[PDB]
Amino acid sequence: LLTAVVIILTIAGNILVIMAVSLEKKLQNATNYFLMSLAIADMLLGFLVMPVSMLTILYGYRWPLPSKLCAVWIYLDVLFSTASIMHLCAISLDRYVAIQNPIHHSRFNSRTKAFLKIIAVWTISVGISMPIPVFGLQDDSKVFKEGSCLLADDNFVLIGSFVSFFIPLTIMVITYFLTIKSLQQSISNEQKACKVLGIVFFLFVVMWCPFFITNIMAVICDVIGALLNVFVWIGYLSSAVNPLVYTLFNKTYRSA
Ligand SMILES: NCCc1c[nH]c2ccc(O)cc12
Numbered sequence: 006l007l008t009a010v011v012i013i014l015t016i017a018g019n020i021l022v023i024m025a026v027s028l029e030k031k032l033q034n035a036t037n038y039f040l041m042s043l044a045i046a047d048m049l050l051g052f053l054v055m056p057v058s059m060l061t062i063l064y065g066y067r068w069p070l071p072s073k074l075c076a077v078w079i080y081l082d083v084l085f086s087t088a089s090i091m092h093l094c095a096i097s098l099d100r101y102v103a104i105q106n107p108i109h110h111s112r113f114n115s116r117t118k119a120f121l122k123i124i125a126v127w128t129i130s131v132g133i134s135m136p137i138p139v140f141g142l143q144d145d146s147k148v149f150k151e152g153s154c155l156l157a158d159d160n161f162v163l164i165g166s167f168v169s170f171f172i173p174l175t176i177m178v179i180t181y182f183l184t185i186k187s188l189q190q191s192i193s194n195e196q197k198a199c200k201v202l203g204i205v206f207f208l209f210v211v212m213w214c215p216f217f218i219t220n221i222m223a224v225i226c227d228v229i230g231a232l233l234n235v236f237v238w239i240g241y242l243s244s245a246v247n248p249l250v251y252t253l254f255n256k257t258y259r260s261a
Pocket residue numbers: 082083086087156161162165166169220237
């Protein structure tokens with residue numbers, strides 16, 4: 006099965022990134038600490054929610070696990086996915102600040118920057134996902150649809166997509182545009198930086214954007230469910246690629 010390789014690839018890659026950060030002394034910085042937090046978020050995703058989704062696939066969407074654990078699976082999924090998305094948004098904003106005015110960024114670049122960034126993205130990821138477990142454990146009608154775990158509460162779905170993906174999308178489009186506008190023998194390295202930024206941004210858009218577009222179009226409107234069933238796993242594929250496209254541009258990670 007195609008989903009059998011994705012769990013192993015995610016669990017291997019994130020362990021490799023965290024072991025390379027812990028072992029290589031040259032990779033101790035604020036940005037690499039934020040990247041280790043990103044790898045922690047996707048490793049928790051690939052360990053906790055991804056074989057559960059494979060189990061849901063192997064039973065034909067009739068959920069084998071009992072009904073008490075549905076509201077925490079949506080909680081873990083939304084929490085780790087919002088953590089990953091806000092991690093990429095904060096990385097894009099920090100790259101724009103560190104590329105537009107490099108003197109004033111390095112003037113304020115303490116480890117308090119990294120700790121406040123991690124605190125902000127995890128606080129946001131907790132606070133956006135807050136109505137999931139309190140309103141789902143006793144109220145099974147809002148987190149079930151025809152005997153399967155799904156977010157039936159579309160009033161949560163529309164607003165949560167709006168705060169979780171589309172406002173990060175409208176932030177990262179602006180910061181990517183202004184970072185390309187600010188990158189226009191350093192001229193040779195700026196082209197490699199532009200290529201890496203383009204690959205990372207368009208890969209994020211391609212990996213996450215079909216699922217949220219069809220998720221909002223589900224609430225605006227069985228083809229939609231069959232599209233969602235594979236676009237979720239396309240969304241899970243971002244968490245295995247995000248260690249690769251954020252580390253392999255630096256040769257120290259490849260030498261590790
Ligand atoms: N697999 C859940 C993906 C996800 C991340 N953030 C979300 C916000 C709302 C929602 O319906 C879904 C999500």
